[PDB]
């Protein structure tokens, strides 16, 4: 769909700006870690006979 957006620039501008706003938001709320949770779940039970 080129020559339709080519004839109407501001439309494409709106799409791109909406995109940039969406990304601008999603970079604030999104958690910043080092790596995703990769290690398997490890439930641990612990007791102590004094």
């Amino acid at each position: 769909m080129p020559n339709f957006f080519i004839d109407r620039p501001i439309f494409a501008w709106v799409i791109a700006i909406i995109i940039m706003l969406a990304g601008g938001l999603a970079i604030l709320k999104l958690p910043v870690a080092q790596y995703p949770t990769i290690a398997p779940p490890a439930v641990t039970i612990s007791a102590s006979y004094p």
């Binding site: 109407r8 501001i10 439309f11 501008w13 709106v14 706003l21």
Partner: peptide, 18 residues
């Protein structure tokens, strides 16, 4: 505010004018 901005955008899209 952001709703107003978005609306202005879509309006500029329909009218092809700022």
């Amino acid at each position: 505010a952001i709703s107003l901005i978005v609306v202005f955008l879509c309006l500029a899209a329909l009218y092809e004018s700022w």
